[PDB]
Design an enzyme around this catalytic site. Sequence first.
Site, short mmCIF file in Angstrom:
data_model
loop_
_atom_site.label_atom_id
_atom_site.label_comp_id
_atom_site.label_asym_id
_atom_site.label_seq_id
_atom_site.Cartn_x
_atom_site.Cartn_y
_atom_site.Cartn_z
N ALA B 15 0.82 -1.22 0.00
CA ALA B 15 0.00 0.00 0.00
C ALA B 15 0.84 1.25 0.00
CB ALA B 15 -0.93 0.03 1.21
N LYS B 39 12.64 -1.23 10.71
CA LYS B 39 11.83 -2.30 10.13
C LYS B 39 12.11 -3.54 10.95
CE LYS B 39 9.35 -4.33 6.71
NZ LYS B 39 7.96 -4.04 6.26
N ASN B 158 -13.85 0.79 1.68
CA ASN B 158 -14.04 -0.36 2.52
C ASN B 158 -12.80 -0.63 3.38
OD1 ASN B 158 -15.69 -2.64 3.32
ND2 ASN B 158 -14.13 -3.90 2.31
N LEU B 180 -1.59 8.61 -2.27
CA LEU B 180 -2.12 8.96 -3.55
C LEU B 180 -0.96 9.08 -4.57
CD1 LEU B 180 -4.32 9.83 -5.44
CD2 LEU B 180 -4.17 12.16 -4.45
#
Lengths: 224, 224
Positions: B15, B39, B158, B180
């Site tokens: 994502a 990480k 959703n 975006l």
Amino acid sequence: FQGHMLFISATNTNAGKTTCARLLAQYCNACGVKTILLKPIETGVNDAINHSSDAHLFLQDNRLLDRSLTLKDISFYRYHKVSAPLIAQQEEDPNAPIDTDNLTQRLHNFTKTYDLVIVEGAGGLCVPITLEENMLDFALKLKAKMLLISHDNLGLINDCLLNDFLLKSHQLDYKIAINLKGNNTAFHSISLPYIELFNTRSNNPIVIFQQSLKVLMSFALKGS
Amino acid sequence: FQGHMLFISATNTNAGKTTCARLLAQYCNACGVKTILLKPIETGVNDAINHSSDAHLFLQDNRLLDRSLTLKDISFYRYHKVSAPLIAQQEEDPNAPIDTDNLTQRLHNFTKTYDLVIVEGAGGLCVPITLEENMLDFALKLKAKMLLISHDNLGLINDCLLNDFLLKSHQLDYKIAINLKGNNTAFHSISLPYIELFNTRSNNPIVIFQQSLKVLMSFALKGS
Ligand SMILES: Nc1ncnc2c1ncn2[C@@H]1O[C@H](COP(=O)(O)OP(=O)(O)O)[C@@H](O)[C@H]1O
Ligand SMILES: Nc1ncnc2c1ncn2[C@@H]1O[C@H](COP(=O)(O)OP(=O)(O)O)[C@@H](O)[C@H]1O
Ligand SMILES: NCCCCCCCC(=O)O
Ligand SMILES: NCCCCCCCC(=O)O
Ligand SMILES: [Mg+2]
Ligand SMILES: [Mg+2]
Ligand SMILES: [Mg+2]
Ligand SMILES: [Mg+2]
């Protein structure tokens, strides 16, 4: 009772609701469980030029039980915009908010003439229909059982578990089923080991749709 | 206080956690907010042959503040299998379950020497780390704030709302931000209209990451 009603939602759009709904209804009908497929709300459609929408596929299957059915008998709010229903409605039909009370009546009417009424949603559970109501809210108003279809790719664990958390927080009977596509054997190596662990630790197991036609028919028909 | 800590999760893998974490840390450092990227757990890696993992990218950026850092200073459980951490660990290192108490200590130690410690998870919130703990549970143990990155495609409503429901049910400060991408103007037509409605109706709005560097820095640093 009058016919049972099963809502079909998903992790998201394109996960396999339509495909799995058709497979389940075919199986049920073959078993003598008279079953109709409904798509009350559909976006992203142009019916003047395309006859391959979910409602059109449902209609083809349904006409094997009732030649008189037409698209408008099984799908009631239809929009061009490829978006959530609320946004499509506000843009294309601002004076007609989607009326879930009306939809509930229309859908329940089919329980007179069918043993099982399968109702496909649009997108996932949290998809907005009205300002107040999402797809889950609609399923709750319907008093339907829930079948939630998951995709079969990396990431399904998260997506299934997010839905499990939302569903278990509400008062409905539900099952999560993975739509395992032909040619995917990564699933069995990558994701399945966790599904198996989860199932040993959960009262409501995640199943594989393609392994589960009989189980899901039983689920759909059980109780009141 | 010692340095603040911000956990970065997402709607799912791919994502934009890594991309957005790097952009946020770059911005913070440019503003004089000394920021490290960690990480702690990474799957799907082969460090002998590939130097482009999230931890490697983080290391490149981090070495602009501390030349002595090495991969093992910022990433602690690393596995080849492209899977959830729990499954990778059980297969590759069955005798060493991931120790989140140890990770919490290592991560908090960096709050001595940095104003902000950014901790990227792996996949989404419900991704399993141990039998008992998922990524959200880890973030809760850390007492970090949460930044949840969403994808920018059809279906984000959703996915964002499923995460909102889980996050608002737990005791942590969180923000959902949409990543975006360049060249996506469908977003503004398809999804943004609902984000705007949601925000007028919510106490905790969904933001666009690229519009929000200053706001997210402020969020990350606020309070205790
Ligand atoms: N098990 C499957 N095998 C092959 N193709 C599939 C399978 N499930 C879904 N598809 C394809 O994936 C796409 C999306 O499926 P669909 O059932 O329409 O999902 P949804 O109703 O959730 O949007 C369609 O092109 C469909 O034919
Ligand atoms: N805003 C963006 N613009 C262009 N490419 C992006 C953007 N965000 C992510 N990507 C690309 O998408 C892929 C996944 O991004 P990444 O940040 O690694 O996600 P995650 O950490 O959630 O797995 C990478 O190839 C990355 O370069
Ligand atoms: N790039 C390696 C990421 C591993 C993602 C694990 C996702 C697990 C899931 O939610 O099914
Ligand atoms: N095929 C048309 C499906 C419309 C999907 C709407 C998804 C909304 C979202 O959750 O962002
Ligand atoms: Mg579809
Ligand atoms: Mg469909
Ligand atoms: Mg990644
Ligand atoms: Mg990453």
